[PDB]
């Protein structure tokens, strides 16, 4: 029983070190500095916006796309088709012209 | 951890058991070497025969 | 079947801690009480020659009881004997059968206590261990000879 105790005690000690360091790990995660941004970010939009960015993440995610790579690769290919395509005084000389 | 506490009680029982179980040899010892000096007596009667 | 919530086993093997104290554990060495005893019988069957009155009578029913007491002592003896045989037999047969059984651990605990592991118990096995018996009573010292004869060479 003496060394049954002692195997217990340290089977226990190891159950311990990971259940605690874990906890530690959820309250981390709980709550996670990530975590506050990303809700309050979320919770930043107006009523249509919100409901519009709610319905987009529910296409994105039946596709899978709701991921940081899609978003980025959409930013990135939208920036690359603005910059180099640089972008009144159009609508002024028109209607100048017609006049 | 709640099952441990019930493996201290019993090895404390089993403690308890071991004392008394080593006390009841002493004393069966005991009456045993009693009747060793019994017989020891009986040898010294003989001799005065 | 009751399981045991006290984690105390029924039947455990043979920790080595107290393989030790097994092997201290025997029959006490009693045959010098019993050369004693059978040193003072030959003198008291000196003394009995060198005192009884060859012209009286009686001493057979002296020598018949000092025979039965020898015959009975000769056998306690053999009972000790045997007793310390089966002794050493058992303790032989309990460390082949308790290290047979998987030493003790947590999970041997659970096993042991539970009934799931089965050892030898010594407090069983020496129940179960055979009584004490007469072996090779020790009537070969002169002392039965003239206890069983000296009726008949008083007579």
Same mark, same amino acid.
Request: aromatic share 8%; hydrophobic share 30%.
């Given at each position: 029983?003496?060394?049954?105790?002692?195997?217990?005690?340290?089977?226990?000690?190891?159950?311990?070190?990971?259940?605690?360091?874990?906890?530690?790990?959820?309250?981390?995660?709980?709550?996670?500095?990530?975590?506050?941004?990303?809700?309050?970010?979320?919770?930043?939009?107006?009523?249509?916006?919100?409901?519009?960015?709610?319905?987009?993440?529910?296409?994105?995610?039946?596709?899978?796309?709701?991921?940081?790579?899609?978003?980025?690769?959409?930013?990135?290919?939208?920036?690359?088709?603005?910059?180099?395509?640089?972008?009144?005084?159009?609508?002024?000389?028109?209607?100048?012209?017609?006049? | 951890?709640?099952?441990?506490?019930?493996?201290?009680?019993?090895?404390?029982?089993?403690?308890?058991?071991?004392?008394?179980?080593?006390?009841?040899?002493?004393?069966?010892?005991?009456?045993?070497?009693?009747?060793?000096?019994?017989?020891?007596?009986?040898?010294?009667?003989?001799?005065?025969? | 079947?009751?399981?045991?919530?006290?984690?105390?086993?029924?039947?455990?093997?043979?920790?080595?801690?107290?393989?030790?104290?097994?092997?201290?554990?025997?029959?006490?060495?009693?045959?010098?009480?019993?050369?004693?005893?059978? !040193? @003072?019988?030959?003198?008291?069957?000196? $003394?009995?020659?060198? *005192? /009884?009155?060859?012209?009286?009578?009686?001493? %057979?029913?002296?020598?018949?009881?000092?025979?039965?007491?020898?015959?009975?002592?000769?056998?306690?003896?053999?009972?000790?004997?045997?007793?310390?045989?089966?002794?050493?037999?058992?303790?032989?047969?309990? !460390? @082949?059968?308790?290290?047979?059984?998987? $030493?003790?651990?947590? *999970? /041997?605990?659970?096993?042991?206590?539970?009934? %799931?592991?089965?050892?030898?118990?010594?407090?069983?096995?020496?129940?179960?261990?055979?009584?004490?018996?007469?072996?090779?009573?020790?009537?070969?010292?002169?002392?039965?000879?003239?206890?069983?004869?000296?009726?008949?060479?008083?007579?």
């Amino acid at each position: 029983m003496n060394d049954v105790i002692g195997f217990f005690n340290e089977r226990e000690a190891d159950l311990k070190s990971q259940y605690e360091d874990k906890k530690k790990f959820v309250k981390e995660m709980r709550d996670t500095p990530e975590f506050q941004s990303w809700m309050r970010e979320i919770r930043s939009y107006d009523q249509d916006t919100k409901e519009k960015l709610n319905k987009v993440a529910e296409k994105y995610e039946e596709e899978g796309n709701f991921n940081l790579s899609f978003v980025q690769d959409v930013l990135d290919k939208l920036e690359s088709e603005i910059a180099m395509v640089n972008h009144e005084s159009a609508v002024t000389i028109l209607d100048q012209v017609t006049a | 951890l709640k099952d441990k506490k019930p493996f201290a009680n019993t090895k404390k029982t089993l403690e308890n058991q071991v004392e008394e179980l080593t006390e009841k040899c002493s004393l069966k010892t005991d009456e045993f070497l009693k009747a060793k000096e019994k017989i020891n007596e009986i040898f010294e009667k003989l001799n005065t025969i | 079947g009751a399981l045991n919530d006290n984690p105390i086993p029924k039947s455990v093997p043979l920790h080595p801690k107290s393989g030790k104290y097994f092997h201290n554990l025997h029959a006490r060495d009693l045959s010098n009480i019993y050369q004693q005893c059978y !040193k @003072q019988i030959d003198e008291t069957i000196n $003394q009995l020659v060198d *005192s /009884t009155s060859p012209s009286t009578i009686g001493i %057979e029913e002296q020598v018949a009881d000092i025979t039965s007491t020898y015959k009975l002592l000769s056998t306690y003896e053999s009972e000790s004997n045997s007793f310390d045989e089966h002794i050493k037999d058992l303790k032989k047969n309990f !460390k @082949q059968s308790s290290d047979a059984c998987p $030493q003790i651990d947590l *999970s /041997t605990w659970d096993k042991y206590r539970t009934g %799931e592991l089965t050892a030898p118990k010594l407090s069983e096995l020496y129940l179960n261990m055979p009584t004490p018996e007469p072996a090779t009573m020790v009537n070969n010292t002169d002392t039965l000879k003239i206890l069983k004869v000296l009726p008949y060479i008083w007579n």
